[PDB]
């Protein structure tokens, strides 16, 4: 059987705080939110490139205060987009290396996506627990806002479903996660977006990660008990018909992956096998990580590291997969072998 093997460790941020990472397939290019080279640049909070190609770059300033989250749209190549505490929405292109666009948000971004459907669409989740809806083509303000649904606290995971030919789900719009409350807010045609309560109690902290063709996400949440555990939740998506043919969107546990104590939470990851066959794996931040066979619910691999992991991205380049873990400082390289 092929599996993850260890090929190279990188020391991203010796000051560390290194916290999220994104990958860009069309420059082939990894990305990780590090405060700055210090004594060197000013200070602040911004990425280091990481060349794929070469496995080799360079550092681009962004913000002023803590990156919490990285996404590039497949729709702009090498569209950067982050959210920070800064109380800012930025993109920054890896073409031109340069921020070129600045949304304020007026208030701290505790996380950030793009949509996946026909849209040039940013959602932005603020401290207050709204998500702000920006669209490209307007550079001033945000066109609509989705206000907190129960309590008004940080919208901390944005997670998007894109539409698809699938009888079981076919719709898009996107998962959205405060401290207390998890929403699918399903776009419409018309591309204004409506609320459903997802069958779950997040109690402090939440992570929505997608997986597009099978129409399932991995939620790892705290439940809100005084005296519990974090957990993964594979959770498959389904929906009802109400009386006037609109769709009741929920969704339903496949497994349950169970974790640790404690939430200060790796971004996880789920994706589909290096094999192309169809199968999905299920990726778990303990000093470990963990990868588990979607289909089966049993344990593939446990990736040890010397430090907690807080991020993990899959990436493609010259027709080979890799999977980066990422720490506090450093960045581990595996190889699909
Ligand atoms: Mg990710």
Redo the contacts with the bound molecule.
């Keep these: 059987k092929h599996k993850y093997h260890f090929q190279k460790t990188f020391t991203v941020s010796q000051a560390g705080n290194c916290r999220?990472?994104?990958?860009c397939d069309a420059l082939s290019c990894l990305v990780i939110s590090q405060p700055s080279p210090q004594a060197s640049f000013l200070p602040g909070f911004g990425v280091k490139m990481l060349s794929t190609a070469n496995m080799k770059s360079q550092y681009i300033p962004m913000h002023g205060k803590q990156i919490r989250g990285?996404?590039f749209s497949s729709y702009l190549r090498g569209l950067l987009l982050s959210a920070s505490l800064d109380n800012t929405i930025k993109l920054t292109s890896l073409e031109t290396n340069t921020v070129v666009q600045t949304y304020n948000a007026g208030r701290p971004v505790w996380s950030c996506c793009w949509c996946l459907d026909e849209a040039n669409y940013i959602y932005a989740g603020l401290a207050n627990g709204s998500i702000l809806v920006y669209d490209v083509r307007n550079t001033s303000s945000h066109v609509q806002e989705l206000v907190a649904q129960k309590a008004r606290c940080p919208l901390v995971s944005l997670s998007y479903m894109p539409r698809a030919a699938s009888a079981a789900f076919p719709y898009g719009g996107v998962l959205a996660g405060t401290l207390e409350d998890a929403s699918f807010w399903e776009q419409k045609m018309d591309f204004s977006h409506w609320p459903h309560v997802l069958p779950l109690e997040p109690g402090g902290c939440i992570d929505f990660?997608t997986e597009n063709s099978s129409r399932h996400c991995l939620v790892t949440y705290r439940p809100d008990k005084n005296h519990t555990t974090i957990r993964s939740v594979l959770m498959e998506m389904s929906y009802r018909l109400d009386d006037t043919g609109n769709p009741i969107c929920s969704c339903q546990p496949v497994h349950t992956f169970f974790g640790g104590p404690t939430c200060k939470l790796t971004?996880?990851?789920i994706f589909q096998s290096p094999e192309n066959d169809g199968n999905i794996l299920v990726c778990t931040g303990a000093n470990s990580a963990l990868l588990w066979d979607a289909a089966s619910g049993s344990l593939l691999q446990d990736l040890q590291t010397d430090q907690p992991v807080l991020?993990?991205?899959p990436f493609e380049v010259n027709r080979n997969s890799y999977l980066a873990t990422l720490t506090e400082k450093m960045v581990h390289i595996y190889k699909w072998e």
Excluded: E, G, T, V
Aim: hydrophobic fraction near 55%; charge should be neutral.
């Design positions: 999220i990472m994104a990958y990285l996404a990660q971004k996880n990851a991020d993990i991205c």
